């Protein structure tokens, strides 16, 4: 239901923001984590976007409708970046590490991690 360029702008910025947050967290907490655990958390970022895409779209559409003009791709870049920095993923990083729940790293996760962020599949509702 959304122009591909707009979708791509969103996904690229959301994942980039989540990933920056993860880097910041890993500097503090990453020492005792295995490579696959870190890869699993990078997957958790992409998956959080997939899971919450539909409710992000509500928010996005509300913001776009309020722009006072037709949107351009830059608007989606900006909104994507806002989502990317505002979601506090560290609550999950800390919980998963503290409770030893960092997911076992599986092929579907690697497949998602190897994709371009622009290509991560999302489902509109």
């Amino acid at each position: 239901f959304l122009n591909k360029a707009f979708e791509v702008a969103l996904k690229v910025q959301i994942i980039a923001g989540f990933d920056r947050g993860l880097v910041k967290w890993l500097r503090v907490h990453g020492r005792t984590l295995s490579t696959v655990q870190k890869k699993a958390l990078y997957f958790v970022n992409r998956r959080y976007m997939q899971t919450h895409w539909a409710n992000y779209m509500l928010w996005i559409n509300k913001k776009i409708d309020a722009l006072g003009r037709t949107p351009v791709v830059g608007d989606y870049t900006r909104l994507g970046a806002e989502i990317g920095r505002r979601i506090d993923m560290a609550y999950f990083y800390d919980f998963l590490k503290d409770k030893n729940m960092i997911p076992k790293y599986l092929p579907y996760m690697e497949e998602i991690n190897r994709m371009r962020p622009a290509d991560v599949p999302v489902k509109y509702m």
Binding site: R47, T51, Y91
Partner: protein
């Protein structure tokens, strides 16, 4: 989607974590939260969601789900209840309904 759980915090400032693991048709998932109906897509494999105990519509992150409550519980003055429900619509069959509950210790 038989496998799901909520992991509650001990402090209203720290959101609860909802985790589900889907194997396999699931058409729709809607979380009924105090701040509204929140759609989520449960993808194959693991899915995660934060649930906040407090609401600030101005400062909350996009798409946040906030618990209903706090509710007093009869005969138990040490805790209060926060809850949301979830409705899962399937391609064929009646929808399924989940109760997501967190008890918070009182001051």
């Amino acid at each position: 989607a038989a496998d799901w759980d909520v992991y509650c915090s001990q402090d209203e400032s720290i959101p609860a974590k909802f985790i589900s693991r889907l194997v396999t048709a699931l058409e729709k998932t809607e979380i009924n939260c105090s701040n509204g109906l929140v759609p989520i897509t449960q993808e194959f494999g693991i899915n995660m969601m934060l649930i906040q105990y407090t609401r600030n519509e101005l400062l909350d992150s996009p798409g946040m789900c906030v618990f209903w409550g706090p509710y007093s519980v009869p005969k138990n003055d040490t805790v209060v209840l926060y809850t949301v429900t979830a409705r899962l619509k399937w391609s064929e069959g009646p929808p399924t309904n989940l109760s997501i509950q967190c008890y918070m210790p009182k001051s």
